[PDB]
């Protein structure tokens, strides 16, 4: 045993980290309101769309606080029709620096710290849960998180999901409504704790997790056959044919499609150095601006059909 | 904000259960052995046929015992061909033995951990490899003392925890299937990582894995047949392992019969099949040696498949002449 284990590092605690990289009761509050408001849409006690983006990943601080002050300015613009939490997807934890230099503990600690930096500004944020380890880390700053599609089927990740505090997506049709279903029970796992040891978790059970699809009149209404009673609203996931398929979905949306309550949109300061991403490639800011203003006006108009 | 935990209850490390039941001498060596045997067939220093074989899941320590003795005297007539290890498969994605053992709604995990590592020391203490589906990350470090065989399940074959798992794991690792998902894995495996694990004295530490070199790919779909399987060779990259030909129930027979047609014809990328097998046949809902998840073949079916495999294996030693 232990033959293709090199060793074991020493890992800060969950609480360890918590105490040093503290959130501001700004941070508290925002990602709690954006838990909030992301809840009121995908169950249709509101109508504004949410709308997840921002970049593929983060690999620097810097220009992830810059976008993230663009965004919010942009975000009190349209906040009577838009909710907006910032894709913040870390990549970053695993290796912050470069050169294979995989110091996970700086990374954790960058992690947070980002983290605490976007909801300052009163800026909520999502990720991409696939650690089941490293969400008891950050937690308390996300008001939303997103199962990737590779992931969709795996027991440990509905699980996880079961016992997360914020809505959580999955992306498809059968397996992602399987996925919500399952999300939506009570679980018993061995997971580990704030103090870093493995305990045995149960959860609750998480009422609000929704379909991600990953666009056109017609397969949205073969997706709303799907979904059986007690579902929420769907969201759909949009380089440069994302303004396309705004245009769709905000056609949708004005002429009164009110199962559409989400979207989510992969972009950056710059499209495709400062500001553009290290993996998948993004629109950039004028373009994102543009595909916002689009599906606010949108929802407006959509409030007017019905 | 912990709003979603009901909350925590205690659960023994590792190292504490491998005290509490600790493996025998023999229970160790017949890990050690079954993992050179898959090695040695699967790497193709060894022209046997691998075979993992059993039930689809584990709800009854007395009759997995009966089932093993049946398999191991079986295997002790056929050990020339044929290179034997028990699939005792605890996590079910009824979770299984380890979440449930009282297969009620009790959860009682510290007892199903108990339980596995039990019926794990009681197989292999008779001589009997076992091989096991690795779903859940944590509990590997309670079993893998006795384990010579892993598979990762075709639901979580694409999940990059699962394929670091793999990359520290000391045993050979199936990856299941179209193929690319489980070809990239098996690539992924083979490489180092470094993630969050937990250790054995049950605390969470940053672990660094060495990659494995013994991933192969498990088809199981029709998947089996001499176009598919020579559709799947030309997809292997330069370092790779022979195919695994997963028959899963009625028809275990049938796809049986074509690829021991396969093999016995000089197909030697073959080297291993998958096989699910009870001491009587279909299943249940939640009676002895019935199967309580999927349906499996029962044991007079299963001596004729493997018999009929043993001499297909036979029968290919003389084509390799």
Redesign the interface.
């Known amino acids: 045993?232990?033959?293709?284990?090199?060793?074991?590092?020493?890992?800060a605690?969950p609480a360890l980290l918590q105490v040093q990289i503290p959130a501001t009761p700004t941070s508290l509050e925002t990602a709690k309101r954006g838990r909030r408001e992301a809840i009121d849409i995908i169950t249709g006690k509101d109508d504004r769309v949410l709308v997840i983006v921002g970049p593929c990943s983060i690999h620097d601080l810097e220009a992830a606080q810059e976008y993230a002050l663009r965004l919010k300015k942009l975000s009190d613009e349209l906040k009577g029709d838009l909710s907006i939490i910032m894709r913040a997807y870390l990549g970053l934890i695993?290796?912050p620096d470069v050169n294979n230099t995989?110091n996970?503990?700086k990374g954790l600690q960058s992690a947070r710290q980002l983290f605490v930096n976007l909801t300052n500004i009163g800026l909520p944020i999502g990720s991409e849960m696939?650690?089941?380890?490293?969400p008891q880390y950050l937690?308390?700053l996300v008001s939303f998180g997103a199962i990737g599609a590779?992931?969709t089927?795996?027991?440990?990740h509905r699980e996880l999901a079961?016992?997360?505090?914020f809505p959580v997506g999955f992306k498809n049709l059968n397996v992602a409504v399987d996925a919500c279903q399952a999300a939506a029970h009570?679980h018993?796992?061995?997971?580990?704790?704030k103090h870093?040891?493995?305990?045995?978790?149960?959860?609750?059970?998480?009422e609000h997790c929704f379909v991600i699809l990953r666009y056109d009149a017609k397969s949205v209404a073969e997706a709303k056959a799907q979904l059986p009673a007690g579902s929420n609203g769907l969201m759909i996931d949009y380089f440069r044919n994302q303004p396309k398929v705004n245009d769709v979905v905000c056609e949708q949306i004005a002429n009164g499609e009110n199962a559409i309550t989400g979207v989510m949109i992969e972009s950056n300061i710059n499209e495709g150095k400062y500001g553009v991403s290290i993996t998948d490639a993004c629109i950039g800011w004028e373009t994102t601006e543009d595909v916002l203003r689009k599906l606010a006006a949108a929802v407006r108009q959509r409030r007017e059909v019905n």
């Open positions: 045993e232990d033959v293709r284990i090199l060793g074991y590092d020493p890992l605690s695993n290796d995989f996970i503990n696939l650690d089941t380890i490293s937690a308390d590779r992931t089927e795996s027991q440990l079961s016992g997360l505090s009570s018993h796992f061995m997971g580990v704790t870093g040891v493995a305990a045995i978790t149960t959860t609750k059970g998480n």
